[PDB]
Design a protein around this nucleic acid. Structure first.
Ligand SMILES: [Mg+2]
Ligand SMILES: [Mg+2]
Ligand SMILES: [Mg+2]
Ligand SMILES: [Mg+2]
Ligand SMILES: [Mg+2]
Ligand SMILES: [Mg+2]
Ligand SMILES: [Mg+2]
Ligand SMILES: [Mg+2]
Ligand SMILES: [Mg+2]
Ligand SMILES: [Mg+2]
Ligand SMILES: [Mg+2]
Ligand SMILES: [Mg+2]
Ligand SMILES: [Mg+2]
Ligand SMILES: [Mg+2]
Ligand SMILES: [Mg+2]
Ligand SMILES: [Mg+2]
Ligand SMILES: [Mg+2]
Ligand SMILES: [Mg+2]
Ligand SMILES: [Mg+2]
Ligand SMILES: [Mg+2]
Ligand SMILES: [Mg+2]
Ligand SMILES: [Mg+2]
Ligand SMILES: [Mg+2]
Ligand SMILES: [Mg+2]
Ligand SMILES: [Mg+2]
Ligand SMILES: [Mg+2]
Ligand SMILES: [Mg+2]
Ligand SMILES: [Mg+2]
Ligand SMILES: [Mg+2]
Ligand SMILES: [Mg+2]
Ligand SMILES: [Mg+2]
Ligand SMILES: [Mg+2]
Ligand SMILES: [Mg+2]
Ligand SMILES: [Mg+2]
Ligand SMILES: [Mg+2]
Ligand SMILES: [Mg+2]
Ligand SMILES: [Mg+2]
Ligand SMILES: [Mg+2]
Ligand SMILES: [Mg+2]
Ligand SMILES: [Mg+2]
Ligand SMILES: [Mg+2]
Ligand SMILES: [Mg+2]
Ligand SMILES: [Mg+2]
Ligand SMILES: [Mg+2]
Ligand SMILES: [Mg+2]
Ligand SMILES: [Mg+2]
Ligand SMILES: [Mg+2]
Ligand SMILES: [Mg+2]
Ligand SMILES: [Mg+2]
Ligand SMILES: [Mg+2]
Ligand SMILES: [Mg+2]
Ligand SMILES: [Mg+2]
Ligand SMILES: [Mg+2]
Ligand SMILES: [Mg+2]
Ligand SMILES: [Mg+2]
Ligand SMILES: [Mg+2]
Ligand SMILES: [Mg+2]
Ligand SMILES: [Mg+2]
Ligand SMILES: [Mg+2]
Ligand SMILES: [Mg+2]
Ligand SMILES: [Mg+2]
Ligand SMILES: [Mg+2]
Ligand SMILES: [Mg+2]
Ligand SMILES: [Mg+2]
Ligand SMILES: [Mg+2]
Ligand SMILES: [Mg+2]
Ligand SMILES: [Mg+2]
Ligand SMILES: [Mg+2]
Ligand SMILES: [Mg+2]
Ligand SMILES: [Mg+2]
Ligand SMILES: [Mg+2]
Ligand SMILES: [Mg+2]
Ligand SMILES: [Mg+2]
Ligand SMILES: [Mg+2]
Ligand SMILES: [Mg+2]
Ligand SMILES: [Mg+2]
Ligand SMILES: [Mg+2]
Ligand SMILES: [Mg+2]
Ligand SMILES: [Mg+2]
Ligand SMILES: [Mg+2]
Ligand SMILES: [Mg+2]
Ligand SMILES: [Mg+2]
Ligand SMILES: [Mg+2]
Ligand SMILES: [Mg+2]
Ligand SMILES: [Mg+2]
Ligand SMILES: [Mg+2]
Ligand SMILES: [Mg+2]
Ligand SMILES: [Mg+2]
Ligand SMILES: [Mg+2]
Ligand SMILES: [Mg+2]
Ligand SMILES: [Mg+2]
Ligand SMILES: [Mg+2]
Ligand SMILES: [Mg+2]
Ligand SMILES: [Mg+2]
Ligand SMILES: [Mg+2]
Ligand SMILES: [Mg+2]
Ligand SMILES: [Mg+2]
Ligand SMILES: [Mg+2]
Ligand SMILES: [Mg+2]
Ligand SMILES: [Mg+2]
Ligand SMILES: [Mg+2]
Ligand SMILES: [Mg+2]
Ligand SMILES: [Mg+2]
Ligand SMILES: [Mg+2]
Ligand SMILES: [Mg+2]
Ligand SMILES: [Mg+2]
Ligand SMILES: [Mg+2]
Ligand SMILES: [Mg+2]
Ligand SMILES: [Mg+2]
Ligand SMILES: [Mg+2]
Ligand SMILES: [Mg+2]
Ligand SMILES: [Mg+2]
Ligand SMILES: [Mg+2]
Ligand SMILES: [Mg+2]
Ligand SMILES: [Mg+2]
Ligand SMILES: [Mg+2]
Ligand SMILES: [Mg+2]
Ligand SMILES: [Mg+2]
Ligand SMILES: [Mg+2]
Ligand SMILES: [Mg+2]
Ligand SMILES: [Mg+2]
Ligand SMILES: [Mg+2]
Ligand SMILES: [Mg+2]
Ligand SMILES: [Mg+2]
Ligand SMILES: [Mg+2]
Ligand SMILES: [Mg+2]
Ligand SMILES: [Mg+2]
Ligand SMILES: [Mg+2]
Ligand SMILES: [Mg+2]
Ligand SMILES: [Mg+2]
Ligand SMILES: [Mg+2]
Ligand SMILES: [Mg+2]
Ligand SMILES: [Mg+2]
Ligand SMILES: [Mg+2]
Ligand SMILES: [Mg+2]
Ligand SMILES: [Mg+2]
Ligand SMILES: [Mg+2]
Ligand SMILES: [Mg+2]
Ligand SMILES: [Mg+2]
Ligand SMILES: [Mg+2]
Ligand SMILES: [Mg+2]
Ligand SMILES: [Mg+2]
Ligand SMILES: [Mg+2]
Ligand SMILES: [Mg+2]
Ligand SMILES: [Mg+2]
Ligand SMILES: [Mg+2]
Ligand SMILES: [Mg+2]
Ligand SMILES: [Mg+2]
Ligand SMILES: [Mg+2]
Ligand SMILES: [Mg+2]
Ligand SMILES: [Mg+2]
Ligand SMILES: [Mg+2]
Ligand SMILES: [Mg+2]
Ligand SMILES: [Mg+2]
Ligand SMILES: [Mg+2]
Ligand SMILES: [Mg+2]
Ligand SMILES: [Mg+2]
Ligand SMILES: [Mg+2]
Ligand SMILES: [Mg+2]
Ligand SMILES: [Mg+2]
Ligand SMILES: [Mg+2]
Ligand SMILES: [Mg+2]
Ligand SMILES: [Mg+2]
Ligand SMILES: [Mg+2]
Ligand SMILES: [Mg+2]
Ligand SMILES: [Mg+2]
Ligand SMILES: [Mg+2]
Ligand SMILES: [Mg+2]
Ligand SMILES: [Mg+2]
Ligand SMILES: [Mg+2]
Ligand SMILES: [Mg+2]
Ligand SMILES: [Mg+2]
Ligand SMILES: [Mg+2]
Ligand SMILES: [Mg+2]
Ligand SMILES: [Mg+2]
Ligand SMILES: [Mg+2]
Ligand SMILES: [Mg+2]
Ligand SMILES: [Mg+2]
Ligand SMILES: [Mg+2]
Ligand SMILES: [Mg+2]
Ligand SMILES: [Mg+2]
Ligand SMILES: [Mg+2]
Lengths: 124, 138
RNA sequence: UUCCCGGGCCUUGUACACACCGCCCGUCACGCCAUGGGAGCGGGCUCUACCCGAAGUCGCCGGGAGCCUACGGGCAGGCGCCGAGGGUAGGGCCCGUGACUGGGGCGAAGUCGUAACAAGGUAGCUGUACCGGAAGGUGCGGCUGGAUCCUUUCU
RNA sequence: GGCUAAUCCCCCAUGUGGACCCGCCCCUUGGGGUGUGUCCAAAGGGCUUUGCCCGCUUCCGGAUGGGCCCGCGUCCCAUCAGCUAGUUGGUGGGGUAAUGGCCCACCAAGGCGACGACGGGUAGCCGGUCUGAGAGGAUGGCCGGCCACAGGGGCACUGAGACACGGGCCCCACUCCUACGGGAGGCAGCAGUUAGGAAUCUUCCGCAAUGGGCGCAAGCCUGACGGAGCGACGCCGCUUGGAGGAAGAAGCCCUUCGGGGUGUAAACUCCUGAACCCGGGACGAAACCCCCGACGAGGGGACUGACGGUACCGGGGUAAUAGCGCCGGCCAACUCCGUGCCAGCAGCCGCGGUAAUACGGAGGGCGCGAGCGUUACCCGGAUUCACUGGGCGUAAAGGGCGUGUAGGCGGCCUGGGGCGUCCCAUGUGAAAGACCACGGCUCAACCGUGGGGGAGCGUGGGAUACGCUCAGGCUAGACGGUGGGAGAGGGUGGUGGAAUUCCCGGAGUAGCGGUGAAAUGCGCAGAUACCGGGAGGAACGCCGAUGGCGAAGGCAGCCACCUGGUCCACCCGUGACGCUGAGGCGCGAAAGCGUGGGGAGCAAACCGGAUUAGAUACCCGGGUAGUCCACGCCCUAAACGAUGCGCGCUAGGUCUCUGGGUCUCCUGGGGGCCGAAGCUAACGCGUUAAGCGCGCCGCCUGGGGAGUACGGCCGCAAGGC
């Protein structure tokens, strides 16, 4: 575009949409489970994927993933939601944080335990 | 009409050298002459001369190239590899003396027009003045 | 050597490369998500017109209608303007809930069509118009981004 | 209701001086001087009271702090385009420390807006901070500067100053008290409570230091402040040992059962000695005050420490926390086992259906290490909004075409100006931060001292190339003149022949028509085929082209009239009059709309016939709107060269339309095809550029959602932008 044109018009700064309305971008948000359901992923993958519908302190109802080998969640469980999506499930935008509130850490987890929220064993 | 006589001349030169002409004719203006004079002092051209063509003044610019070359493509290295306008009508460019560009690590030149006259960057720095940045050449 | 079957070579078009037993578009079904329209109802803002109007400053009275007086005046008090805010009537926008309703997008991939890609088996695309529930079909005109010199199913 | 003092209030005086009206002078907005008239002062207290101290009054100046005013700079939406009656200005008032429509009366009718007014959204601004090669982007916590606010809204009072956080009045909401009349309150001060939240501290110590308020002082006050506490929240420093110690133990892992690994790792030997105990023990503090002097200067002297029995120093002295992420590629680190599209992993591509270096454990390894990871958000990489630094034939992207407004841009020569531009000086650019140097804490973080830098803006001086400007000149651009062309360029009117249909007539008879084959249809009321005549509407064969014209849409028999554009020659006239063009305005195929005409042929819809697994679809018969004309709308398109306009420059060859020429040919202007250089992802483009350049306009920014929704504008509607 001519210099004159840039002078008349100018470039448009490019705004960035948010991947996570955890509302006021907060690193985390507390909420309570509505449903704890399993759901089936998309084409080149098969599994029963563990998921929880949460009402949130934001006033938002969202869908969360429940990472780890097994979970204690159900019903009215209070929970912390951390954001980040499961790729191969449609519309799951956030993860549940193991080891906080009503979601316990993964039983018998030796490798990276700070994810999955489990504490250090004593060597026997 | 011709919107940028200086750009026009620079381009006539480029265009002419890329086909290895011995000379080209640019229409005549004092300012053009001052630019040529810088080029010809600097080694980019053999020189130039005032010339009449159909009763009108022109500047015949005598082009200059390198030795003939070996391998496929015998065509010579150009003496003017690069000749380019900076300040144009429609965006004019004025540098202060601290802002005079240094073209191609000194192997090239910039040509400023200053109230002390048309200078190369070196001339201008030594003369301690800035001006309109006309073109760069290397 | 036209035809059937298999094959070789050159060329051409291709949206095919799990390579035409291909691909895609569309439809009905099922599930999920977001959104359009929306009667009606809940609250919020703002504009105009009119009415009410605290405090206070200012202006006028301050009178045998009160208080002080050195008779000059001062205070109380009174009235008015302005005025926060409230009420009435209407105009306009914003949020929330929302009967009824539109398409959309994902997703197991099942159903049904066979529109497009090969001249895709009626060349295609196209603006507009009519018909069709839709895919699409036809008219008129246009484009080449068209191969070449009985109507022939799904995989 | 009553008494009463004062540095409380008032009256007269004195008037240095000052305030006001009028005049005069200098000065120039209301600054300074001067004259006459008027008006205006004061407070007393302490002492060793014979003179000092503390104060009081008027004035002039200083210093500091502020008010007001102007230039410039300061986010998103134009789906916000018009806003405005104190509105814009004037005279005169009012108000104030002071200018002002700040407020009021009267008068005029203005003011602002595409250089974005008005509206809506968001937001305290800055020094700086983060990021970035830079330009730029993002941010504004703490520290410093400014603004604003003190539950919400209004208002003033008292003052030098407030329209006042811990002051006052009123309205509103809320909490509490309430003898139901009425009252009290305001942590966005320090702590602390409670709620919301992913989340953010002690109801600590001290007045010792610096600072502040009052006091003659002594002194009092100070949740400013100096400190300590809590939290790996950040940064920096530090420890978990050091030297020896096997061809190398045990255990655990891998194994080709030969061995390999963890691993000098351990054990063990020796040395040092975080922690801890004992002892001493701070700087930060010398003024205020005392002494001599003179309550000065000068000299000299003594009191005071929250932090703290802390830091630090001396002596003694124990081998004494390690975790976290990762090891498919990007990306540094691989093997075994379990699992079998499960369980799971996942930032992206992907991994998992029996050998999984991708899941889970283990061994081993890589990276960091009192941390290591995760999520969120900012810059980066992203030259992915491209000023630096991108694009539009086919990837997203040239507006359907023009005319031109605003604006952007502007040939050659000379002169004045010196606005842009450049140079010098100067002022400003606080401190902190950043940079450099030197220094203080054992180092560092942290801090101190000094130096440098710095865009921008003010003032003075200077330069004149370029841009601007004014003045004059030129003719190469542009326009004109004369003469000569070609042309389906446009509008109006007329007219000619071929063919279809229909009507009349003659002659003639058994079918015609139509298809792959058929059938519907038409024909004995005589069709088809043949001849003659008539009516009517639409379109113009050959010429005709690989042609021409137009800005595009688009334009085709012939004639005449009206009219646009354009090309060449002559080199005659003007003298830069130029290019481009947001908005506007006009044109704009086909279909479509309105009114009125026309209606031969064709024909959406429709009615029928064979096909044939159906049929509304491809074939056949019929057929209405429409197709045609007038006038008025519609404004789309593969409106395409999918290629905006103009100008200059960069080989040729070949075919062609149209001028000129001394006419193998040359020289203009169009249309084509191949190709130099060059360009392009390639295909291709290539003097008819997609090459080299300048000017201007339009447009693009992953694919769907979607040319959808909402809004607006236009339209009779369809529907368009
Ligand atoms: Mg899979
Ligand atoms: Mg030559
Ligand atoms: Mg010479
Ligand atoms: Mg060059
Ligand atoms: Mg530049
Ligand atoms: Mg400058
Ligand atoms: Mg360098
Ligand atoms: Mg065969
Ligand atoms: Mg053969
Ligand atoms: Mg082949
Ligand atoms: Mg091929
Ligand atoms: Mg094709
Ligand atoms: Mg494929
Ligand atoms: Mg709905
Ligand atoms: Mg709805
Ligand atoms: Mg009233
Ligand atoms: Mg009142
Ligand atoms: Mg007032
Ligand atoms: Mg009286
Ligand atoms: Mg009163
Ligand atoms: Mg009123
Ligand atoms: Mg009201
Ligand atoms: Mg399907
Ligand atoms: Mg079909
Ligand atoms: Mg079709
Ligand atoms: Mg088909
Ligand atoms: Mg077809
Ligand atoms: Mg086709
Ligand atoms: Mg059509
Ligand atoms: Mg319909
Ligand atoms: Mg059909
Ligand atoms: Mg049809
Ligand atoms: Mg057609
Ligand atoms: Mg095609
Ligand atoms: Mg053909
Ligand atoms: Mg057929
Ligand atoms: Mg067949
Ligand atoms: Mg009394
Ligand atoms: Mg008395
Ligand atoms: Mg006197
Ligand atoms: Mg007196
Ligand atoms: Mg007094
Ligand atoms: Mg007295
Ligand atoms: Mg006395
Ligand atoms: Mg001052
Ligand atoms: Mg008004
Ligand atoms: Mg008025
Ligand atoms: Mg006035
Ligand atoms: Mg006003
Ligand atoms: Mg302006
Ligand atoms: Mg605004
Ligand atoms: Mg705000
Ligand atoms: Mg901001
Ligand atoms: Mg940095
Ligand atoms: Mg950097
Ligand atoms: Mg950038
Ligand atoms: Mg920066
Ligand atoms: Mg900012
Ligand atoms: Mg804070
Ligand atoms: Mg601050
Ligand atoms: Mg307020
Ligand atoms: Mg509060
Ligand atoms: Mg309130
Ligand atoms: Mg208030
Ligand atoms: Mg005072
Ligand atoms: Mg106060
Ligand atoms: Mg107050
Ligand atoms: Mg205030
Ligand atoms: Mg308070
Ligand atoms: Mg106070
Ligand atoms: Mg009170
Ligand atoms: Mg109150
Ligand atoms: Mg507090
Ligand atoms: Mg809570
Ligand atoms: Mg604290
Ligand atoms: Mg205390
Ligand atoms: Mg003190
Ligand atoms: Mg003090
Ligand atoms: Mg106190
Ligand atoms: Mg403190
Ligand atoms: Mg050792
Ligand atoms: Mg061993
Ligand atoms: Mg181990
Ligand atoms: Mg071994
Ligand atoms: Mg020892
Ligand atoms: Mg001390
Ligand atoms: Mg001391
Ligand atoms: Mg003291
Ligand atoms: Mg003495
Ligand atoms: Mg002394
Ligand atoms: Mg010691
Ligand atoms: Mg020792
Ligand atoms: Mg040990
Ligand atoms: Mg790989
Ligand atoms: Mg790395
Ligand atoms: Mg690797
Ligand atoms: Mg399993
Ligand atoms: Mg993992
Ligand atoms: Mg992430
Ligand atoms: Mg197995
Ligand atoms: Mg295995
Ligand atoms: Mg595998
Ligand atoms: Mg593995
Ligand atoms: Mg991985
Ligand atoms: Mg593993
Ligand atoms: Mg550290
Ligand atoms: Mg980024
Ligand atoms: Mg960069
Ligand atoms: Mg982008
Ligand atoms: Mg650019
Ligand atoms: Mg690009
Ligand atoms: Mg395409
Ligand atoms: Mg395109
Ligand atoms: Mg075009
Ligand atoms: Mg348009
Ligand atoms: Mg134009
Ligand atoms: Mg103009
Ligand atoms: Mg100009
Ligand atoms: Mg010029
Ligand atoms: Mg000049
Ligand atoms: Mg100047
Ligand atoms: Mg500084
Ligand atoms: Mg040091
Ligand atoms: Mg700066
Ligand atoms: Mg300066
Ligand atoms: Mg100056
Ligand atoms: Mg001069
Ligand atoms: Mg002139
Ligand atoms: Mg002419
Ligand atoms: Mg003529
Ligand atoms: Mg002739
Ligand atoms: Mg014609
Ligand atoms: Mg004509
Ligand atoms: Mg005609
Ligand atoms: Mg006829
Ligand atoms: Mg007859
Ligand atoms: Mg018939
Ligand atoms: Mg019959
Ligand atoms: Mg019959
Ligand atoms: Mg008969
Ligand atoms: Mg007969
Ligand atoms: Mg007949
Ligand atoms: Mg006849
Ligand atoms: Mg008729
Ligand atoms: Mg023909
Ligand atoms: Mg043609
Ligand atoms: Mg043309
Ligand atoms: Mg055409
Ligand atoms: Mg003519
Ligand atoms: Mg002449
Ligand atoms: Mg002349
Ligand atoms: Mg226009
Ligand atoms: Mg049209
Ligand atoms: Mg039409
Ligand atoms: Mg009609
Ligand atoms: Mg009609
Ligand atoms: Mg027909
Ligand atoms: Mg049959
Ligand atoms: Mg049938
Ligand atoms: Mg069939
Ligand atoms: Mg038909
Ligand atoms: Mg075309
Ligand atoms: Mg287009
Ligand atoms: Mg272009
Ligand atoms: Mg000729
Ligand atoms: Mg030609
Ligand atoms: Mg070519
Ligand atoms: Mg080439
Ligand atoms: Mg290029
Ligand atoms: Mg190539
Ligand atoms: Mg090629
Ligand atoms: Mg050319
Ligand atoms: Mg040619
Ligand atoms: Mg060109
Ligand atoms: Mg290109
Ligand atoms: Mg998108
Ligand atoms: Mg449309
Ligand atoms: Mg909207
Ligand atoms: Mg609409
Ligand atoms: Mg309308
Ligand atoms: Mg339409
Ligand atoms: Mg409508």
């Amino acid at each position: 575009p001519t210099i004159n044109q840039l002078v008349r018009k100018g470039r448009e700064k490019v705004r960035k949409k948010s991947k996570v309305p955890a509302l006021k971008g907060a690193p985390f948000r507390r909420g309570v489970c509505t449903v704890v359901r399993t759901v089936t992923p998309k084409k080149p993958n098969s599994a029963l994927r563990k998921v929880a519908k949460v009402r949130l302190t934001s006033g938002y109802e969202v869908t969360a993933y429940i990472p780890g080998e097994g979970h204690n969640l159900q019903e009215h469980s209070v929970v912390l939601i951390r954001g980040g999506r499961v790729k191969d499930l449609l519309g799951v935008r956030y993860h549940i944080v193991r080891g906080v509130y009503d979601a316990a850490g993964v039983k018998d987890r030796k490798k990276s335990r700070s994810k999955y929220g489990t504490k250090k064993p004593k060597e026997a | 009409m011709l919107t940028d006589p200086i750009a026009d001349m620079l381009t006539r030169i480029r265009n002419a050298t890329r086909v290895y002409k011995e000379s080209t004719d640019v229409p005549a203006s004092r300012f053009k002459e001052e630019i040529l004079r810088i080029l010809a002092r600097e080694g980019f051209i053999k020189g130039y001369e005032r010339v009449d063509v159909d009763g009108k003044p022109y500047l015949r610019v005598y082009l200059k190239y390198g030795p003939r070359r070996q391998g496929p493509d015998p065509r010579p290295e150009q003496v003017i590899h690069h000749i380019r306008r900076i300040s144009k009508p429609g965006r004019r460019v004025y540098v202060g003396v601290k802002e005079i560009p240094r073209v191609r690590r000194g192997l090239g030149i910039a040509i400023l027009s200053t109230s002390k006259g048309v200078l190369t960057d070196r001339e201008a720095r030594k003369l301690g003045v800035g001006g309109e940045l006309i073109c760069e050449v290397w």
